[PDB]
Structure formats: C-alpha cells, structure tokens
Amino acid sequence: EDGSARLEARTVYFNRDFKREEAAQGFILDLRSGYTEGALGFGVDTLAMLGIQYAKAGVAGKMRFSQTQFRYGAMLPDMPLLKYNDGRLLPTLFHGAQLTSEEIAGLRFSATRLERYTAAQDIRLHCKNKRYACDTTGNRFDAYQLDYQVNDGLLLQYAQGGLRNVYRQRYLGAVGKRQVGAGKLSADLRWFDSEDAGAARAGKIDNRALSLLLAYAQGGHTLSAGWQRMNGASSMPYLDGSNPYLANYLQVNDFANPEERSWQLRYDFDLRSVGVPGLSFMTRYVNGDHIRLANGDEGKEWERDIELKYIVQSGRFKDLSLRLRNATYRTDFERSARDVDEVRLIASYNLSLF
Ligand SMILES: CCCCCCCCOCCOCCOCCOCCO
Ligand SMILES: [Ca+2]
Ligand SMILES: [Ca+2]
C-alpha cells in the first residue's frame, strides 16, 4: 500500500444469561506506513491498544521488492489456519514474521512463523470447553499457504502448518461467486486435516473438518445453507485467540466437537432496498448432533443468532456503527454449564487519520 492510519473507538456492552454482564471502552490504533522509495522499500507498522485496564503496543518492520513483502514484529494474522478473533474488546496480538509473494499474478504465496501472542505469552491450543487441555503450549506456530485464483469466479487454496509439539494441520479451500441470473450464487468449500505433532503436548489429536456454505443473493436478500462435519477422535484444533474457519462458526459455539454433524440456515437482509440505507438484518440457525461425548452417549446442541447493524448516514456522528448481536444456545449435555443467552451491543467508530 501507500499507507493507512486508523484510530478506532469501540464501545461494547455484553450480557450473558445462564446474570453476568460487562461494559467496555476500547481504542485501537493501527498505523501502516508507506514504503521508502527505491527498489527495496522500507516502512513501519504499529499497533497500540487501550481498554477498560488493558494497555498494549506493537511495532513491525516491513520490506518490499517487486510483488514480495516481508514483515517482522507485531501482527494480526487473518488466514485459514489462524483467523484472528474480533469478538472481544481489543484483538489478539501475535508476534513473528510474515513473507508474502505474488510475482505471478493470481498466484499468492505466504509464509508465517509466530513465536508469541498477547490476549505477552506463548501460543496456546484453544481449549475453552474441555477435551484439549488448557495451557497447552507450542514453541512457535508455522503456516505456509498457496492461493490460486483460477478465474474471476474461482479461488483455490492450499495451506499447511501447525503449533510445534501440539499439532499439524492441512487445509484445502475453494471459494467463488457466479451470476445466475438476476442474483449472485456463492459456494465456499473448506477442509482441514489435523493430527498431533512432535511431543504431542495435548496429546493425541485426530480430525478431519469439512464445511460447505452455499449462498444465493439477489437485491438485498441472501439465503444461505451450510453443512459441516467432523471426523476422527478429536475436535478440530485451533489457536487460542482465533476462530476456527468453518461455515458453522457462530456467535457462541463452533459445532466442531468430535464427530459432530451440523446444518445451517441463514438469512441476510440489507434494507438499502426498502430505503433505509445503513440498516442490515441477519438471522441464522444451526442444528448439530452426532457428538461423541466422553460419556459414550450422543450429544445434541443448537444455536440461533439474530443481528442488527446500523450505520449512521450523515451528521457529526456519520459512519458510527451500532451493532446488536443475540445468541441463544442449548445442548442436551452439561446443560447448566453451557446453555447461554447472550446479548452484545457494539458501538464502533473508525477515524481515518490520513
Ligand atoms: C423464542 C423466540 C425468540 C425470537 C423469535 C423470533 C422469530 C423470528 O425470527 C427468527 C429467528 O428467531 C428464532 C428464535 O430463536 C429461538 C427459537 O428457535 C427457533 C428456530 O427458528
Ligand atoms: Ca508514509
Ligand atoms: Ca470445540
């Protein structure tokens, strides 16, 4: 790029019913310099965050030549093996190195090694509901990825890596949109293959994760149907501070328990068409079963989400975002412990500093 600077103010109220509620104000500072002039360019990236008391700050250096770029330092990774999580006050912060290269157009290559992270400690296996032991650590996290954009309508994805001494994971993706005929048809195919690696600090891990999402969008209306399936002894592993990149990753639950199968229905409505621009509505529903409980029994769970988003169109407060997120989640196993109603209210404003 030729830079960007982005001061973000984030107001979030969060209510959970099992009761427990929280309110929070956050500030995210994101500065990406341009590159110095000359064949090999240099620049700097800086993250600063402030919450309520959380205070955190990052720097990364970057170089660039041709269509290739390297970065070292503080980082928000966004990729199939690690989707950084956007669902608390201040994002997670990883530390390490990233090389990307796209010298042949439509063919992108990426490599990434992560030493540390800040929710400033060592990288962790996500564990937040049991199975995988908590505080399972890896020395580093590596990923390598190849993106082939076959056409305007189709993108192929391979990726590979893992948390050293916990797990290795492979990934295939295929995304694409197609006009047909007044609206636009979309398919999103994701596959993950994971197993324990090295010392197996978590220890035995065995999982294949498949998800498929299909959408049809015409006017401001969008109907989406998803299908997700887990195979093997294990749940799908991923990093603490990330979300698993699956079709049925919802507000509260990931549907990625062992041997779990689930389906989703979702509807998105943009009311720019009814003449209330900046007003968007969403509702989705996932049903899951076939969970192999440590019990020996089968588990069933479902979740329904409702969302409202409003972007003010004009005024001093123009482009401020109001977002309402509601989750209802129920199981037939460990009901007290994991049933929830959740309400997230989010007010967010991005000031461009340039
Ligand atoms: C208990 C009803 C809560 C909200 C009612 C809204 C009904 C129309 O909106 C559709 C999405 O809401 C689904 C309701 O969630 C809990 C009941 O589950 C129904 C599954 O469709
Ligand atoms: Ca600059
Ligand atoms: Ca899980």
Provide the residue range defining the domain that includes 346: 2-354
Rounded CA-CA distance 14/283 in Å is 19
Among 174, 172, 156, 239, CA closest to 208: 172
Ligand 1: centre distance to CA 13 (Å): 22
Rounded CA-CA distance 208/3 in Å is 40
Task: Give residue for tokens 């990330």.
Answer: 242
Total Cβ atoms within 10 A of residue 22: 10
Q: Is 349 helix (H, G, I), strand (E, B) or coil?
A: strand
Q: Is 119 helix (H, G, I), strand (E, B) or coil?
A: coil
Question: Number of folded domains in the chain?
Answer: 1
Instruction: Tell whether ligand 1 has an atom less than 6 A from the beta carbon of residue 328.
Output: yes
280 and 269 in contact (C-beta within 8 Å)? yes
Which residues face 5 on adjacent strands? 31
Region for 255 from its dihedrals, namely left if φ exceeds 0, alpha if ψ lies in -120 to 50, beta otherwise: left
Ligand 3: centre distance to CA 284 (Å): 19
Rounded CA-CA distance 191/245 in Å is 10
Cβ-proximal residues to 96 (8 Å cutoff; 6+ apart), any chain: 72, 75, 112, 113, 114, 115, 116, 140, 141
Total Cβ atoms within 10 A of residue 223: 14
User: Minimum-distance ligand to the CA of 330?
Assistant: 1
165 and 138 in contact (C-beta within 8 Å)? yes
Region for 89 from its dihedrals, namely left if φ exceeds 0, alpha if ψ lies in -120 to 50, beta otherwise: alpha
172 and 202 in contact (C-beta within 8 Å)? no
Rounded CA-CA distance 74/96 in Å is 7
Cα→Cα distances 162→141, 165, 194, 198, 242, Å: 6, 9, 9, 11, 13
Q: In what order do the strands lie in the sheet with 82-84?
A: 78-79, 82-84, 242-243
Instruction: Tell whether ligand 1 has an atom less than 6 A from the beta carbon of residue 281.
Output: no
Total Cβ atoms within 10 A of residue 349: 15
Query: Which atom of ligand 1 is found nearest the CA of 283?
Result: 11
Rounded CA-CA distance 68/113 in Å is 17
Rounded CA-CA distance 162/196 in Å is 9
**Structure determination method:** X-ray
Rounded CA-CA distance 167/233 in Å is 14
CA atoms within 13 A on the CB side of 265: 3
272 and 292 in contact (C-beta within 8 Å)? no
Among 266, 172, 176, 264, CA closest to 227: 264
CATH number at residue 75: 2.40.160.10
E-assigned strand segments in 92-247: 93-101, 107-118, 121-122, 141-151, 154-163, 167-179, 184-196, 206-218, 221-231, 242-243
> Which residue has the CA at smallest separation from atom 9 of ligand 1?
283
Mutational test site, ligand 1, from 306, 308, 326, 339, max ligand atoms within 8 Å of CB: 306
Q: How far apart are the first and last CA of the chain?
A: 13
Among 314, 329, 318, 130, CA closest to 248: 329
Mutational test site, ligand 1, from 264, 285, 325, max ligand atoms within 8 Å of CB: 285
242 and 85 in contact (C-beta within 8 Å)? yes
